[PDB]
Write an enzyme that holds these catalytic residues in place. Structure first.
Site, PDB file in Angstrom:
ATOM      1  N   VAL A   1      -4.311   9.264  -0.012  1.00 57.68           N
ATOM      2  CA  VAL A   1      -4.072  10.617  -0.098  1.00 57.68           C
ATOM      3  C   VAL A   1      -4.769  11.274  -1.008  1.00 57.68           C
ATOM      4  O   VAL A   1      -4.846  10.440  -2.242  1.00 57.68           O
ATOM      5  CB  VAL A   1      -2.587  11.039   0.245  1.00 57.68           C
ATOM      6  N   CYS A   2      -5.397  12.414  -0.999  1.00 56.94           N
ATOM      7  CA  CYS A   2      -5.896  13.274  -2.122  1.00 56.94           C
ATOM      8  C   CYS A   2      -7.025  12.533  -2.677  1.00 56.94           C
ATOM      9  O   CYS A   2      -7.940  11.932  -2.020  1.00 56.94           O
ATOM     10  CB  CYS A   2      -4.918  13.688  -3.009  1.00 56.94           C
ATOM     11  N   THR A   3      -6.722  12.387  -4.273  1.00 61.48           N
ATOM     12  CA  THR A   3      -7.876  11.742  -5.089  1.00 61.48           C
ATOM     13  C   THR A   3      -7.433  10.138  -4.901  1.00 61.48           C
ATOM     14  O   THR A   3      -8.628   9.567  -5.423  1.00 61.48           O
ATOM     15  CB  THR A   3      -7.840  12.246  -6.386  1.00 61.48           C
TER      16      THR A   3
END
Lengths: 227, 229
Positions: free
Chosen positions: B102-104
C-alpha cells in the site's frame, strides 16, 4: 492552545473506528491526540491488534474533542459507571462530543443522546431510540456540538467533517489529498440498501446474537437513566 | 487454527499507520486468518503520528506467508536500503500466494527487485519513482499484475484489502465484509486526487513534498544501481 483530542481506547475496540480518525486528525496543525483508558499501557482490540493507551482518566487534560469508537467492547462500557462518569465529565466542557459506529451507544448509555439526532452502525440502529435519540439514517450526523458517524469506515468521513469544523475547508482538503481519499470500492455492498439480498441476510445472521445481547444491555441502561 | 491463511505486514519505525491498520481490520474479518506484524524483533514500533504498534514476530521466526504486505510512510526511505529487510521480503515473495503493498510500500518492493517489468501504483505524489525501479506505472487505485497487488496512497489500503479478500475467498465473502464495515464512503469534499482537488491545494502539497521527493529520488537511484549490479 493546542487542540486537545481524546479517543477512548477500551478492550475489544474495533480498532479502525479509532485508527482511521486518528491518522486524519493527527495530520492537523496544533493538535495533541490522547488515547485514554483507566491506566496507560496495552489495550487489545477485537482483532488481536495491540494498541497503547497514553493516559489514564486522571491525567487526561481537558479535551476540546472527545471521541468514542465502537466495537465488541461497547457492551461492557454501557454498564461501567466509571467510564460513563468520565465521559460525562469531559463532555461538560468539550467543544465537540463525538463517536463512530457503536460508540454512539456508549454516549447514549451516558445520557448524552437524549433528544438529539444521531446515527450508528446500520445493524444496531434500532438501539438509538430507547437511549433517547432521534435516529437519523445518514453517515455523519451533527446536532449542535454532537457529531456521530455511522458504521466502522464512516470514521474517515466523520474525521474530515470534524477537521473542517475545527479549522476550515482548505485544511480538510489538504489532508484529504495527502491521504489520497478518493475511494473506489471494488463492490457496491457497503449499505443494506445496495448490497445483494443474500449478502444482507448473511450479515444480519452473523450480527444477530450480538444484537440480542445489546438489546438487553440497552434496556437496562435506559432504565437507569429513567430512574 | 493451524490451517489458517498466514498474512504478514512489515511494521517499521515511522510507518504510516493507516496503511497497515486499515487492511488489518479488513483482513482480520475473514475466516481462519492469522495476521503477523513483522520487524527485526518483537516489541513496540512507533508510527509517524506517534501511535505505538506492537510487532508480534521477528524476521527469523516468521512462518512462511501466504500474503506479504508492505505499508508505506516516512520510514520507507530507510527500508529501501536495509539489506536485512529486503532479503526477508525476497525470501517470502518466492513462495507467497500474493505479494502486496500500500502507498509508498511499493517503492520497497521496487528496491527488492520485485517490480521489474510489472504494473504497479503508489501514492500520487511519489508515482514518478516507480519507473526507475523497473515498474510500468499505472494511475489506478488498486493494480494487479499476476500475484502482485499494489494500492495507491494511504486510504487506498481499504480498497486494496477488499480486492484481496475476493481473491483469497470469493466476491460474496468480500461483499459481506464490506457491508459489516459499512463501507459506502461519502467524503465531505472532493479533494482526494490531484485531478479533482482545487489547484491551490495540489500546489501547496507539491510544495510541501518537494524536499522528500528529491531525497527519495536519490535513494531510489541508489537502489536501482544495486539491482543493476
Amino acid at each position: 492552545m493546542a487542540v486537545q483530542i481524546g479517543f477512548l481506547l477500551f478492550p475489544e475496540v474495533q480498532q479502525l473506528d479509532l485508527t482511521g480518525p486518528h491518522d486524519v486528525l493527527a495530520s492537523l496543525p496544533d493538535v495533541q491526540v490522547h488515547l485514554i483508558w483507566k491506566e496507560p499501557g496495552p489495550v487489545v482490540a477485537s482483532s488481536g491488534l495491540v494498541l497503547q493507551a497514553t493516559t489514564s482518566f486522571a491525567d487526561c487534560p481537558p479535551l476540546d474533542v472527545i471521541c468514542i469508537p465502537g466495537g465488541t467492547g461497547v457492551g461492557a462500557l454501557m454498564e461501567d459507571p466509571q467510564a460513563l462518569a468520565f465521559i460525562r465529565q469531559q463532555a461538560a466542557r468539550a467543544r465537540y462530543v463525538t463517536s463512530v459506529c457503536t460508540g454512539s451507544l456508549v454516549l447514549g448509555a451516558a445520557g448524552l443522546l437524549q433528544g438529539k439526532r444521531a446515527t450508528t452502525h446500520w445493524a444496531y440502529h434500532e438501539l438509538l431510540a430507547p437511549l433517547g435519540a432521534i435516529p437519523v439514517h445518514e453517515r455523519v450526523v451533527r446536532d449542535g456540538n454532537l457529531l456521530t458517524g455511522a458504521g466502522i469506515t464512516a470514521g474517515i468521513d466523520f474525521a474530515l467533517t470534524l477537521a473542517a469544523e475545527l479549522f476550515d475547508a482548505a485544511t480538510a482538503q489538504r489532508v484529504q489529498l495527502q491521504l489520497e481519499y478518493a475511494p473506489a470500492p471494488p463492490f457496491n455492498a457497503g449499505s443494506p440498501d445496495t448490497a445483494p439480498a443474500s449478502v444482507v441476510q448473511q450479515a444480519r445472521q452473523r450480527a444477530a446474537d450480538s444484537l440480542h445481547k445489546r438489546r438487553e444491555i440497552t434496556l437496562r441502561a435506559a432504565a437507569r437513566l429513567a430512574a
